[PDB]
Design a protein around this ligand. Structure first.
Ligand SMILES: CC(=O)N[C@@H]1[C@@H](O)[C@H](O[C@@H]2O[C@H](CO)[C@@H](O[C@@H]3O[C@H](CO)[C@@H](O[C@@H]4O[C@H](CO)[C@@H](O[C@@H]5O[C@H](CO)[C@@H](O[C@@H]6O[C@H](CO)[C@@H](O)[C@H](O)[C@H]6NC(C)=O)[C@H](O)[C@H]5NC(C)=O)[C@H](O)[C@H]4NC(C)=O)[C@H](O)[C@H]3NC(C)=O)[C@H](O)[C@H]2NC(C)=O)[C@@H](CO)O[C@H]1O
Ligand SMILES: [Zn+2]
Ligand SMILES: [Zn+2]
Ligand SMILES: [Zn+2]
Length: 389
């Protein structure tokens, strides 16, 4: 990188009910789009979880009269975005919260690791992407933690060999989605991750929700010693442990949520609740663009650095990030020499001044301008190999 990352996860399932297509991305604000998620088999095989979303869906300008074997779906739409935004890199993300059960097996043998790297890189180079993001939630012991390093080294080795043959001098990126909870990150080979990876996407959110005994801030920076029940976690303790454990500050990208977590039948922050209630798309989760809801007021914990809405009438509390929160988090990350901002996920953002991703772009100042790759001479898709020319 030659500047800060401003990266966003784009979900392939967002093309359905959320109706958020790659052309809806405000691409001018983004250095990296992390395309989520590929699924994984126990033998290391990386697979599409949705071939329609990935490469079959025909958009308005996609013709069934094209000759040969061609890519459509989000793959062609993202290649269009890359052409129009030469500073924007697209990463292939594998796993995620719901598809991490097969990682231990996938990383467990030389054969499975070689099959993971080959199948992942096959998608990357056929689809015209710039790298790979591993989202293993989460390595659970020392065997898994060390096998995770062996898997990353196999992917790095195969990426370099691929570039040597089919993109000489291009550096394909290798990243992970990393846990903010010490119970998980204490198990990782932090010094090894610091050496092998381009970036660690720190998932500095999901600190409180339905899994909590009490309500709490979802993504606060600091502990609040005068209301510690509101801050079961804090980002700052995680960031310091990652750097001191051997991850260089500039490789850490600070994850921020474009959604809020709701608690029902509660008095306030750091208190008892009964149930998380409804959501935008799933129980207890609200898209940022739906917040704050009518009848709720937003209050700031200036010690924990966290905003939340409360509706006295409905006894509903929602923890979420505001533009001011992004400005505070960007000042924080710059103060520690971190690599930039990451967002989960693109579809829920507001447009214009109130955009969290746009707020971050403006607060960061100087973004990574490293050029993406448009040359895929070994793609099995004739339109990708021809650069959609
Ligand atoms: C400090 C500490 O230790 N805290 C612990 C805490 O971390 C733990 O909570 C977990 O944390 C991790 C981070 O560490 C979370 O995982 C990351 O963060 C994001 C946001 O949470 C994750 O995002 C979720 O990702 C899953 C997929 O993995 C999403 O699942 C999708 O759900 C939708 C439904 O909304 C499905 O969509 C439908 O799809 C069909 C077709 O397939 C379509 O036809 C429909 O129209 C479509 N429509 C709708 C309306 O949905 C979709 O199929 C499915 N996709 C898949 C692949 O299953 C889910 O929606 C995302 N959640 C939010 C919110 O956006 C993300 O996985 C991961 N990021 C990365 C980069 O890895 C994790 O979410 C969180 N867990 C929980 C349960 O919240 C907790 C655990 O208990 O413990 C604390 O101690
Ligand atoms: Zn539907
Ligand atoms: Zn590198
Ligand atoms: Zn700029």
């Amino acid at each position: 990188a030659n500047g800060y990352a401003n990266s966003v996860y784009f979900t392939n399932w967002g093309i359905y009910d959320r109706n958020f297509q790659p052309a809806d991305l405000v691409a001018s604000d983004v250095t990296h789009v992390i395309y989520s998620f590929m699924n994984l088999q126990a033998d290391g095989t990386v697979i599409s979880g949705d071939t329609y979303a990935d490469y079959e869906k025909h958009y308005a300008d996609d013709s069934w009269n094209d000759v040969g074997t061609n890519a459509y779906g989000c793959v062609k739409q993202l290649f269009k975005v890359k052409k129009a935004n030469r500073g924007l890199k697209v990463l292939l993300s594998i796993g995620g919260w719901t598809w991490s059960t097969n990682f231990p097996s996938a990383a467990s043998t030389d054969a499975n690791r070689k099959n993971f790297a080959k199948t992942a890189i096959t998608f990357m180079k056929d689809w015209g992407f710039d790298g790979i993001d591993i989202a293993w939630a989460y390595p659970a012991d020392a065997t898994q933690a060390s096998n995770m390093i062996l898997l990353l080294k196999e992917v790095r080795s195969q990426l370099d060999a691929y570039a040597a043959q089919y993109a000489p001098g291009y550096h394909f990126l290798l990243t992970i989605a990393a846990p903010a909870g010490k119970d998980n990150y204490s198990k990782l080979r932090l010094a090894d991750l610091g050496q092998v990876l381009d970036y660690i996407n720190l998932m500095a959110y999901d600190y409180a929700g339905s899994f909590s005994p009490l309500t709490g801030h979802d993504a606060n920076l600091f502990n609040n010693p005068s209301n510690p029940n509101a801050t079961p976690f804090n980002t700052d303790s995680a960031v310091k442990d990652y750097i001191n454990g051997g991850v260089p500050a500039n490789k850490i990208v600070l994850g921020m949520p474009i959604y809020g977590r709701s608690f029902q039948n509660t008095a306030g922050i750091g208190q008892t609740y009964n149930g998380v209630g409804s959501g935008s798309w799933e129980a207890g989760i609200w898209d940022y663009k739906a917040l704050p809801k009518a009848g709720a007021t937003v209050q700031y914990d200036s010690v924990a650095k966290g905003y939340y809405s409360y509706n006295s009438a409905t006894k509903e509390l929602i923890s979420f990030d505001t533009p001011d929160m992004i400005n505070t988090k960007v000042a924080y990350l710059k103060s520690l020499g971190l690599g930039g901002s990451m967002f989960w996920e693109a579809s829920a953002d507001k447009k214009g001044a109130d955009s969290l991703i746009g707020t971050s772009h403006r607060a960061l100042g100087g973004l990574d301008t490293t050029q993406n790759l448009l040359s895929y001479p070994n793609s099995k898709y004739d339109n990708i190999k021809n650069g959609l020319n």
